[PDB]
Design a binder for this molecule. Structure first.
Ligand SMILES: Oc1cccc(CN(CC2(c3ccccc3F)CCCC2)c2ccc(OC3CN(CCCF)C3)cc2)c1Cl
Ligand SMILES: Oc1cccc(CN(CC2(c3ccccc3F)CCCC2)c2ccc(OC3CN(CCCF)C3)cc2)c1Cl
Lengths: 230, 216
């Protein structure tokens, strides 16, 4: 996995991309949290099958894969939602049959930040290749500071090696788009600064799910491990 | 601001660095007091961060209201970098995790990360100014937002310049840049958990405006 070229690492991420799902509702009938809850639960399954295809991820122990998924899953859903919404200014495309504006999201604070992130992606003309690299970064980075045995330290070192390889891959893509060296690292910095906004949005979202104090509203270690299908 | 060279960028950030404060010569009360004194120094530091005073007072208050704990936290991690397993809130206030916890360990993990990257002082002050500018639709706000993104790009150039001066290769340059900037997601994370804890017991917009809205 540390041996793949930048072109190969991109093609692997593009072929691993999960599908866009539809919301589960009756369109002949006149409950939003339940609809979004249900949609997120079903997206989560496809995310985990995507993560398994992220080069270097299945080199980790199953325990460490679950930990990274635990820390990252909501950021990963959110960046996909924001990517999906780039072409629909003012609205969030949770699903092709569930395009919502901010007055329906009424809570609204996170909705507004997702819309802002979608705008910035849009006016940056974020490319498909770049977006799948950013998803990989979130998966590996979000849990890397919340793991200290010997083995864990080897696992952290491997995660940092793969993150360096994703960085190289992103720069390769900007180089191939014709950007100058200065423009390459300026764009790389802009894209990583947005990931900290996405982390903030995920933090507020997780804060809301934990305040529900409801057993099956935060994916458990066992639920994620089951979806990983050892 | 937009005219400064990379070297003048670093010199201004270094010139503007606030002092390390001491604790008085019961724990949460001493930490609250030390943080209250640091906040005052951080306002005048922020006024000296290129691009910042070009902003409206209202935008400056919003940026500090959003970033203040992150900035406090990155300063604490920096101060603790050379003291494995301890948080140096002040030279006379060195705590270990037993005296706290979840937040403490995250802070200790960031400190350990700085150690492994051999984080440099000139790098530290660029990262702290990125936190201020980044963490937080009238024509003027659009004009502010565009200005902030421009200053952020020059700090990126300044960071690259520092690594290039040291002798790092370009591959090592973009790799280290990404490593430094991804740490910022974790500092946002810890700030949000810290806000959560403090509300379970924070400087108001008016307090911030009062300190920032100085006379001549
Ligand atoms: O791609 C998406 C598709 C569908 C929704 C979403 C994001 N959402 C909606 C929002 C939200 C509300 C409250 C808390 C956090 C949140 F983000 C964020 C913006 C509007 C309100 C959401 C809601 C509930 C969620 O909780 C599941 C996990 N389920 C439980 C886990 C058991 F497996 C309940 C997961 C996400 C994405 Cl990013
Ligand atoms: O450099 C530092 C110097 C002194 C303390 C700190 C950070 N802290 C201590 C810790 C903490 C962090 C996050 C949340 C709660 C917390 F306990 C850090 C890990 C364990 C305890 C802290 C304590 C009280 C606080 O209360 C404000 C509101 N007050 C400001 C309102 C004035 F109007 C002070 C502000 C931060 C830094 Cl990073």
């Amino acid at each position: 996995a540390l041996s793949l070229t930048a072109d190969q690492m991109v093609s692997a991420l593009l072929d691993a991309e999960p599908p866009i799902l539809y919301s589960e509702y009756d369109p002949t009938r006149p409950s939003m949290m339940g609809l979004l809850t249900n949609l997120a639960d079903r997206e989560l399954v496809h995310m985990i099958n995507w993560a398994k295809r992220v080069p270097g991820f299945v080199d980790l122990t199953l325990h460490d894969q679950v930990h990274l998924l635990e820390s990252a899953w909501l950021e990963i859903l959110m960046i996909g939602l924001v990517w999906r919404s780039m072409e629909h200014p003012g609205k969030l495309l949770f699903a092709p049959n569930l395009l919502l504006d901010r007055n329906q999201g009424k809570m609204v604070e996170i909705f507004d930040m997702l819309l802002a992130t979608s705008s910035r992606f849009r006016m940056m003309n974020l490319q498909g290749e770049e977006f799948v690299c950013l998803k990989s970064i979130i998966l590996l980075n979000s849990g890397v500071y919340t793991f200290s045995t010997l083995k864990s330290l080897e696992e952290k070192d491997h995660i940092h090696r793969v993150l360096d390889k994703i960085t190289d891959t992103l720069i390769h893509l900007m180089a191939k788009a014709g950007l100058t060296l200065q423009q390459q690292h300026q764009r790389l910095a802009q894209l990583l600064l947005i990931l900290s906004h996405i982390r903030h949005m995920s933090n507020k979202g997780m804060e809301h799910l934990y305040s529900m104090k409801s057993k099956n509203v935060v994916p458990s270690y066992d639920l994620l491990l089951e979806m990983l299908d050892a």
